[PDB]
């Protein structure tokens, strides 16, 4: 059974998390616009732009990124023409110096229709912020 | 001289800040979609929806919200059809128990074209997160 627009973007959004979690850069590029912008903890407080910024973290995965477990919670999509706004809570289990920890992030992901992209959608902007 | 699409949304985005800063609820409603969603510190970690949530803060402005000074820094817009993604850094001067303080927020504002709205644009989602 094929997914409608809203279900479809949710699936691609989930697939992107899988790609990031597994360090699959090639997969990342099938879903993310070359001129993607973002606010995220790793971006040091300013808007980061382009894939090169993100590839840096793929090329230098360290040190216990493999122990990490990430899940998306409470996902929702809102459609505005060819734009889809996906909102969710990202919960990350990781190990720190003090032991196992859990952190929650608010995530906004803005997806745009593009039949040229593998799944018919591309990520153009996202905003992730920690609790 | 009239503003093009990108300049136009930046102006409306600035006007919205002016409305919030001055507690002008009527102005707020000329710019913000009735089904607006948001992530923001005031939303207690989950996605808030609707104008009623925001009106609560207008109706209960307290206690030194008038002393506050807010400015937008490094604004940028990206256009995707009828969607405009405005990104900016929000700097807020306020007084705490310990004295005058300054805080920076990352802000994503998603605006959508609508000729029915006063300025031709409506805010449908935003994401604000503190440093």
Residue numbers in the entry:
A (entry chain A), B (entry chain A): 344 to 474
The authors write:
Ca2+/calmodulin-dependent protein kinase II (CaMKII) is a Ser/Thr kinase that is particularly important in neuronal signaling and cardiac function. CaMKII has a unique architecture, in which the catalytic domains are linked flexibly to a hub domain, also called the association domain, which forms a dodecameric or tetradecameric assembly. We reported recently that the activation of CaMKII-α by ATP and Ca2+/CaM triggers the exchange of activated subunits between different holoenzyme assemblies. Our data are consistent with the idea that the CaM-binding element induces the hub to transition from a closed-ring form to a ring-opened lock-washer configuration, which can release or capture dimer units.
Choanoflagellates are the closest living relatives of metazoans. The choanoflagellate S. rosetta has one CaMKII gene. The quaternary assembly of the S. rosetta hub is strikingly different from that of all other hubs in that it forms a right-handed spiral, corresponding to a hexagonal P61 screw axis in the crystal lattice, instead of a closed ring. On looking at a projection down the hexagonal screw axis, the dimers are arrayed in a circle with almost the same diameter as that formed by the dodecameric forms of human CaMKII. An orthogonal view shows that the helical pitch of the assembly is such that the sixth dimer is displaced vertically by the length of a dimer, with respect to the first one. This positions the seventh dimer directly above the first one. At 48 μM, the tetramer and hexamer populations increase further, and a population of octamers now appears. These results are consistent with the open-ended spiral assembly of the S. rosetta hub, which can gain or lose dimer units without steric constraints. Despite the striking dissimilarity in quaternary structure, the interface that holds dimers together in all metazoan CaMKII hubs is very closely preserved in the S. rosetta hub, with helix D from one hub domain packed against the β-sheet of the adjacent domain. The principal structural difference between a subunit in a closed-ring hub and one in the spiral S. rosetta hub is a rotation in the outer edge of the β-sheet with respect to the inner edge of the sheet and the α-helices. The interfacial interactions between the vertical dimers of the hub are between residues on the outer edge of the β-sheet in one subunit, and residues presented by helix D in the other. These interfacial interactions are preserved in the S. rosetta hub, but a change in the curvature of the β-sheet results in a change in the orientation of helix D in each subunit.
